[PDB]
Amino acid sequence: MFLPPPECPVFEPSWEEFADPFAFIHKIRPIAEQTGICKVRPPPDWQPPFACDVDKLHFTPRIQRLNELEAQTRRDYTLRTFGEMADAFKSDYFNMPVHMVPTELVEKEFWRLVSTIEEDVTVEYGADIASKEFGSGFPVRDGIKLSPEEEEYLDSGWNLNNMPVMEQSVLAHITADICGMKLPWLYVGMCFSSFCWHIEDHWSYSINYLHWGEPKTWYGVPGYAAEQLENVMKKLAPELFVSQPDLLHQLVTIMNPNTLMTHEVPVYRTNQCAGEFVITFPRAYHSGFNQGFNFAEAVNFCTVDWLPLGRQCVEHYRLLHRYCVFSHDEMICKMASKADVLDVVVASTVQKDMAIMIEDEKALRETVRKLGVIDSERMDFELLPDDERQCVKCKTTCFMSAISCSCKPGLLVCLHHVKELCSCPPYKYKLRYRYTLDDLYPMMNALKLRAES
């Protein structure tokens, strides 16, 4: 037996409300952050055109066994041959035509199937960022001639290629090519292909658009219940919490939302249909599965609302010895160095995060001086490859400062882990720092001038 969770909120913005995605997300935030996910139906005439040759789009499939609580890690088809496989799979599974399989029946059967070890069902799917094959489902510029209808959507705020580089996004002016977090992912689904329970890197927002095909079923949990959900999963499946040696080595799993609900974790559901958006909020866990053959596109993003949570996230990563995708402090200082061109509300919010950064850094430097670290030298941390500037102990990506020792050339610890670097006494250590305190205060003042205008 499966008892469906309550439905998440659904928003139907007017064209006036829809025009600015960041203003809209800020508006609905008081409601949607209580449920973790929400659905957005665009105005009825906002319809971006979909244009693809099913025979020239190629991708390498991933394969998936469907067993609840089993760990999963974080050939070649055209879109036509995948679709033919996917449709045959589903109509053979149910001995029905595909449009007559009720979505409630697919959902019921999915949770039966994953809990029965007597069933050995495996499925395939596509998941990758855009390239030369495959390509965004939204219109992009390229010197093809576009139709006027495609040109209408080139600069839309809801074209997921544009959303990151808009001015109310803070991941905008970052220049460390991250790939994973400014570029959309493309998802080609089939019946029962599923995404395991997760949150996004650095606790970012995400936005997902279903271009066409059968629906995508979602489960979501509010940010406030994140640690509650994790404690439930630790009890029931401890193997997933053994620390792994790379950010490409993470373990995730399928888990029945009724189990979370039995342990008093709030869970919401929705069926996302073609032409609709789903938005996930910072630190909101989510999972789901595809009802049939379909095609979706998604991207991470970060608003000014998110900035303090981003700082909290990197602290939580340090406690867990988890790798970072980028340095939060580096992004803050980059924006400070471009204060004259920042949105004024962005400038105001970055200024507040920077004040916390500077006070924390002042206290950390005082502590390490009292440990007997005396020598110091400026260092341009942003020039080092990331794997050359991670703390030996907690794996954090250094930027404001680190400790080195000539006893162990090339190794660094952050200022929380001075005792973990090597056996030599601390007078042989060196504080390497990006900025003096006196460099930092004028940087924060530029932001205030920009904000106060």
Ligand X SMILES: CC(C)c1c(-c2cnn(C3CCN(C(=O)CCl)CC3)c2)[nH]c2c(C#N)cnn2c1=O
Please enumerate, by residue number, every residue annotated as part of a binding site for Fe cation: 198, 200, 286
Query: What minimum distance in Å lies between the beta carbon of 300 and ligand X?
Result: 8
Residue with tokens 């693809």: 52
Residue with tokens 């808009």: 166
**Spatial distance between the Cα atoms of 64 and 69, rounded to a whole number of angstroms:** 13
Dihedral, 130, 133, 135, 139 alpha carbons, nearest 10: 150
What angle is formed at CA 121 by the lines to CA 120 and CA 124, rounded to 5 degrees? 140
**Spatial distance between the Cα atoms of 389 and 241, rounded to a whole number of angstroms:** 25
Q: Which does residue 324 bind out of Zn ion, ligand X, Mn ion, none, counting CB within 5 to 8 angstroms by kind?
A: none
Could you say whether residue 296 binds ligand X (CB under 6 A)?
Answer: yes
Query: How distant, in Å, are the alpha carbons of 86, 92, 119, 215, 296 from that of 98?
Result: 10, 9, 22, 12, 19
Q: Which does residue 186 bind out of Zn ion, Mn ion, ligand X, none, counting CB within 5 to 8 angstroms by kind?
A: none
Q: Which residues are annotated as a binding site for 2-oxoglutarate?
A: 125, 206, 208, 216
Could you say whether residue 247 binds ligand X (CB under 6 A)?
Answer: no
Could you say whether residue 414 binds Zn ion (CB under 5 A)?
Answer: yes
| 8-state DSSP, 241 | G
What residue is closest to Zn ion based on CB? 391
**Do the beta carbons of residue 217 and residue 111 sit within 8 Å?**
no
Q: Which stretch binds ligand X (CB under 6 A): 190-198, 225-233, 235-243, 326-334?
A: 190-198
Strand order in the sheet with 194-198: 194-198, 286-290, 216-220, 268-272
Could you say whether residue 119 binds Mn ion (CB under 5 A)?
Answer: yes
Interface with ligand X (CB under 6 A), residue from 189, 282, 292, 310 = 189
Range list of H helices, 140-225: 148-152
Q: Which does residue 268 bind out of Mn ion, ligand X, Zn ion, none, counting CB within 5 to 8 angstroms by kind?
A: none
Report residue 135 as tokens: 């390509």
Could you say whether residue 171 binds ligand X (CB under 6 A)?
Answer: no
**Spatial distance between the Cα atoms of 409 and 418, rounded to a whole number of angstroms:** 15
Query: How distant, in Å, are the alpha carbons of 169, 185, 254, 343, 447 from that of 166?
Result: 6, 18, 35, 10, 19
- Which amino acid, one-letter code, is at 356? I
Q: Which does residue 74 bind out of Zn ion, Mn ion, ligand X, none, counting CB within 5 to 8 angstroms by kind?
A: ligand X
The string of DSSP codes covering 307-319 is HHHHHHHHHHHHH
Query: What minimum distance in Å lies between the beta carbon of 264 and ligand X?
Result: 24
Question: Hey, is 212 helix, strand or coil?
Answer: strand
E-assigned strand segments in 242-396: 251-252, 268-272, 277-280, 286-290, 294-301, 375-378
Give, rounded to a whole angstrom, the gap between the first and last alpha carbons of the chain: 60
**Do the beta carbons of residue 387 and residue 396 sit within 8 Å?**
no
Quick one: 169 or 208, whose CB is closer to ligand X?
Answer: 208
Quick one: 195 or 433, whose CB is closer to ligand X?
Answer: 195
Q: Which stretch binds ligand X (CB under 6 A): 189-197, 255-263, 401-409, 434-442?
A: 189-197
Q: Which residues are annotated as a binding site?
A: 125, 198, 200, 206, 208, 216, 286
Interface with Zn ion (CB under 5 A), residue from 417, 428, 430, 448 = 417
Quick one: 5 or 189, whose CB is closer to ligand X?
Answer: 189
Query: What minimum distance in Å lies between the beta carbon of 46 and ligand X?
Result: 21
Query: What minimum distance in Å lies between the beta carbon of 58 and ligand X?
Result: 16
Backbone angles phi, psi at 224, to 5 degrees: -70, -20
Quick one: 69 or 364, whose CB is closer to Zn ion?
Answer: 364
Quick one: 58 or 416, whose CB is closer to Zn ion?
Answer: 416
Could you say whether residue 111 binds ligand X (CB under 6 A)?
Answer: no
Q: Which stretch binds Mn ion (CB under 5 A): 113-121, 226-234, 257-265, 423-431?
A: 113-121
Q: Which does residue 119 bind out of Zn ion, Mn ion, ligand X, none, counting CB within 5 to 8 angstroms by kind?
A: Mn ion
Residues of span 58-97 touching ligand X by CB under 6 A? 74
**Spatial distance between the Cα atoms of 233 and 231, rounded to a whole number of angstroms:** 5
Q: Binding marks (x or -) toward Zn ion, 348..387, rule CB under 5 A? A: ----------------------------------------
User: Residue 331's closest CA among 135, 139, 175, 208?
Assistant: 175
Q: What is the 3-state secondary structure (H, E, C) of 102-124?
A: CHHHHHHHHHHHHHCCCCCCEEE
Size of the site for ligand X (CB under 6 A): 14
Query: What minimum distance in Å lies between the beta carbon of 125 and ligand X?
Result: 4
**Spatial distance between the Cα atoms of 148 and 151, rounded to a whole number of angstroms:** 5
Quick one: 67 or 193, whose CB is closer to Mn ion?
Answer: 67
**Do the beta carbons of residue 121 and residue 92 sit within 8 Å?**
no
Q: Which does residue 417 bind out of Mn ion, Zn ion, ligand X, none, counting CB within 5 to 8 angstroms by kind?
A: Zn ion
Residues of span 51-110 touching Mn ion by CB under 5 A? 67
Quick one: 295 or 317, whose CB is closer to Zn ion?
Answer: 317
Residues of span 389-408 touching Zn ion by CB under 5 A? 391, 393-394
For ligand X, the binding residues (CB under 6 A) are 74, 125, 127, 180, 187, 189, 193-195, 208, 216, 290, 296, 298
Name the residues that contact Mn ion, by CB under 5 A: 67, 119
